[PDB]
Amino acid sequence: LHHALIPHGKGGRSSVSGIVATVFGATGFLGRYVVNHLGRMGSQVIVPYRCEPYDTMHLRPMGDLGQIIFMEWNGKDKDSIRKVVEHSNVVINLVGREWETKNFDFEDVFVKIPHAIAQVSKEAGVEKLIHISHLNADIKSPSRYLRSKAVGEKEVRAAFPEATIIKPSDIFGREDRFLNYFASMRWFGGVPLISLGKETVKQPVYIVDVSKGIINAIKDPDAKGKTFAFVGPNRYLLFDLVQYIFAVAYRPFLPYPLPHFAYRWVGRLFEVSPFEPWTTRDKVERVHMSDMTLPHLPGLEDLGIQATPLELKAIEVLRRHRTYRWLTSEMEDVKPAKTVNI
Amino acid sequence: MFMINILSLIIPILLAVAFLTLVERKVLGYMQLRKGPNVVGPYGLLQPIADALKLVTKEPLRPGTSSISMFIIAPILGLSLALTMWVPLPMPYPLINMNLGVLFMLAMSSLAVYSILWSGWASNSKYALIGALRAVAQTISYEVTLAIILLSVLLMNGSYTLSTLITTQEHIWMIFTSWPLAMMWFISTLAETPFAMFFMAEYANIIMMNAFTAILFLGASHDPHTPELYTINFVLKTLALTITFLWIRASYPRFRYDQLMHLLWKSFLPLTLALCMWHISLPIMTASIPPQS
Ligand SMILES: CCCCCCCCCCCCCCCCCC(=O)OC[C@H](COP(=O)([O-])OCC[N+](C)(C)C)OC(=O)CCCCCCCCCCCCCCCCC
Ligand SMILES: NC(=O)C1=CN([C@@H]2O[C@H](COP(=O)(O)OP(=O)(O)OC[C@H]3O[C@@H](n4cnc5c(N)ncnc54)[C@H](OP(=O)(O)O)[C@@H]3O)[C@@H](O)[C@H]2O)C=CC1
Incomplete structure (x- = not known):
């Protein structure tokens, strides 16, 4: 290895770990947690931030001085990509847009960009790549999310044969856009879950295991080429979770079997707002699509990471949702949500 | 066009609230x-x-333990009040010449205590709870001096019709007959007075209190033909009072609560009663009872 890359120190902030990460899109739900874990043992992060530095300012206090090197880039510029990963041991990609935008179509964020970084980073001389792909993604899905991620996943794997692909099932956390999303029904009237939601099962995973997997995938040599599926330790019918998290929030559970065709139009009506849409037609059916349990794909336990159940790692994110009426409460209280356990 | 007159008052007062x-x-x-x-x-x-x-x-930002309904209507009342008592002011000719304008001014200005009381309760914090409790008791203590001063002042006026105040003063400023009450009145006005609103609410109260004090004690001559004379005089008098209102803002250490109640109930209330007794008999004393009509 390069002379100024040998791991040193006991893993502190001012200890050179050796990994030279270039995390893409760190200003997100998962990017903050991974860049923290990469900053927690002393890896010089080279993130191209693109938004205002103010929104990227909160990433400063998770690394030693002169470690988190903010860089300017453009998504539609190859030269922008080339500069940031010119000298990097690894490159980590999380470019993802949950809703549909005018400037970026859904395939722009999942077909062009994920492959647009693999070949140039290989051209620059990288050694690794941890581009992630949603586990639920399917080529013939009715959601643009699952189609676009699948077709981009093969391109990045083909362009970079050693590109480890992570398959997160449902990364729940503080602002995971599921738990708060499920909490968001309180203002939006009756929960418009279709057919009362008795026909869809999800397997969610607590986010920091996934980031722990990413760093583990970085230091594990076997990760190159392989594809990892990241799922939690228990799965739930979505009617349980909505009743569950409403009970953890102690809010009045108010389910309503709204017809599928109604929510289809309503989803795009939510998108009419020019700013960040609350709900997208791509997510209307993405929720109602269940999870697969492909066994041949190695998981967290094979990678050396135990998966925390959602029940235990819920009170952290949940406390924001509950008002004073049960703010002082603690864990338990809500029933242990019944798992179907594959 | 009467609606246009309301905007010709609310907005410039709102700007007047903004610009002082x-x-x-x-x-x-x-x-x-x-x-x-x-x-x-x-x-x-x-x-x-x-x-x-x-x-x-x-x-x-909204507190997690905050009742949204009260947290948003308390400023609604606070601004609604602060821009409502500007309507019966006898400034040249008032928008509303309510025959009971003084009573309406007092009832609706005494309603401002609800806004601060609700703000402390809705905020639901140890600081907010006492601060609301301190503010309201300081306020609810001081209408009794407010009401008596205004009542005893109006014996030599004639009625509660705010427009009649101009006719009463005319010859001399009414302070020369009740200057012990003027200092009695002016001091009491100091203590009685979302977060973006609360600037506007109490602040219009600051100017209107001085506008109210201006017409009450330092009147002007309203020529029937030319009204600009009263406009300039009214504005100049209420500016001098407000400058004095801020003159004392940075000239004394702020009052402490036990003295704040002690000052009124033991050194302001009993003297206010005597002056009211003096000004209830003196119109009778000199056969100078005024005409209501
Ligand atoms: C024939 C005549 C009939 C009428 C005669 C009337 C009686 C004679 C005159 C009496 C004194 C004058 C009238 C009352 C004045 C107040 C009396 C009082 O309690 O004073 C002591 C009071 C209390 O003083 P104290 O608390 O130190 O002592 C009081 C007495 N013990 C100790 C027993 C409690 O003084 C104050 O409250 C101090 C001022 C508080 C407010 C701070 C800001 C002051 C700003 C002053 C400058 C601006 C003035 C603006 C005036 C109006 C302009 C439009
Ligand atoms: N609930 C979820 O978030 C789920 C996410 N995933 C996938 O996992 C990853 C999660 O990443 P995370 O950071 O948490 O996601 P976020 O949506 O929270 O943030 C995405 C990040 O990527 C940037 N970005 C996205 N699209 C573009 C684009 N077209 N051009 C430039 N920058 C872009 C964002 O910039 P900016 O901050 O300005 O928007 C931000 O830095 C993504 O691959 C995502 O699709 C999978 C399942 C669920």
Whole structure:
């Protein structure tokens, strides 16, 4: 290895770990947690931030001085990509847009960009790549999310044969856009879950295991080429979770079997707002699509990471949702949500 | 066009509420060897615009343990009140010449205590609870001195019709007959007076209190033909009072609560009663009872 890359120190902030990460899109739900874990043992992060530095300012206090090197880039510029990963041991990609935008179509964020970084980073001389792909993604899905991620996943794997692909099932956390999303029904009237939601099962995973997997995938040599599926330790019918998290929030559970065709139009009506849409037609059916349990794909336990159940790692994110009426409460209280356990 | 007259009052008062703040900071500034806002625009002329649009762009954080319903209607009342008592002022000719204008002014200005009381309760914090409790008791203590002063003042006026005040004063400022009450009245006005609103609510109260004190004690001559004479005199008098109102803002250590109640109930209330007794018999004493009609 390069002379100024040998791991040193006991893993502190001012200890050179050796990994030279270039995390893409760190200003997100998962990017903050991974860049923290990469900053927690002393890896010089080279993130191209693109938004205002103010929104990227909160990433400063998770690394030693002169470690988190903010860089300017453009998504539609190859030269922008080339500069940031010119000298990097690894490159980590999380470019993802949950809703549909005018400037970026859904395939722009999942077909062009994920492959647009693999070949140039290989051209620059990288050694690794941890581009992630949603586990639920399917080529013939009715959601643009699952189609676009699948077709981009093969391109990045083909362009970079050693590109480890992570398959997160449902990364729940503080602002995971599921738990708060499920909490968001309180203002939006009756929960418009279709057919009362008795026909869809999800397997969610607590986010920091996934980031722990990413760093583990970085230091594990076997990760190159392989594809990892990241799922939690228990799965739930979505009617349980909505009743569950409403009970953890102690809010009045108010389910309503709204017809599928109604929510289809309503989803795009939510998108009419020019700013960040609350709900997208791509997510209307993405929720109602269940999870697969492909066994041949190695998981967290094979990678050396135990998966925390959602029940235990819920009170952290949940406390924001509950008002004073049960703010002082603690864990338990809500029933242990019944798992179907594959 | 009567609606246009309302906007011809509410907005400029709203701007008047906006624009004496730069007066405050620069008066308070130049008082302490300082300069006040003078770098943003000429002499801080654009400083009020420099803060207001910033405030409306700031996200209004809401406490987790806050009742939203009360947290948003308390400013609704606070602004609604602060821009309502401007309507019966006998400024040239009042918008509303209510025959009981003084009573209406008192009942609706005494209603401001609900806004601060609700704000402390809705906020639901140890600081907010006591601060609301302290503010309201300080306030609810001081209408009894307010009401008696105004009542005893109006014996020599003739009625509660605010327009009649001009006819009563005419010859001399009414302070010369009740100057012990003027200091009695002026001091009481100091203590009686989302977060973006609360600037506006109490602040219009500050100017209107001085506008109310202006017509009450330092009247002017309203020529029937030319009304501009009363306009200039009314504005000039209420400006001098307000400058004095901020003159004392940075000239005394602030009152403490036990003295604040002690000052009224033991050194302000009993003397207010005597003056009221003096001004209830004196119109009878000299056969100078005034005409109501
Ligand atoms: C024939 C004549 C008939 C009428 C005669 C009337 C009686 C004779 C005159 C009496 C004194 C004058 C009238 C009352 C004045 C107040 C009396 C009082 O309690 O004083 C002591 C009071 C209390 O003083 P104290 O608390 O130190 O002592 C009181 C007595 N013990 C100790 C027993 C409690 O003084 C104050 O409250 C101090 C002022 C408080 C407010 C702070 C700001 C002051 C700003 C002053 C400048 C601006 C003035 C503006 C005036 C209006 C302009 C439009
Ligand atoms: N609930 C979820 O978030 C789920 C996410 N995933 C996938 O996992 C990853 C999660 O990443 P995370 O950071 O948490 O996601 P976020 O949506 O929270 O943030 C995405 C990040 O990527 C940037 N970004 C996205 N699209 C573009 C684009 N077209 N051009 C430039 N920058 C872009 C964002 O910039 P900016 O901050 O300005 O928007 C931000 O930095 C993504 O691959 C996502 O699709 C999978 C399942 C669920």
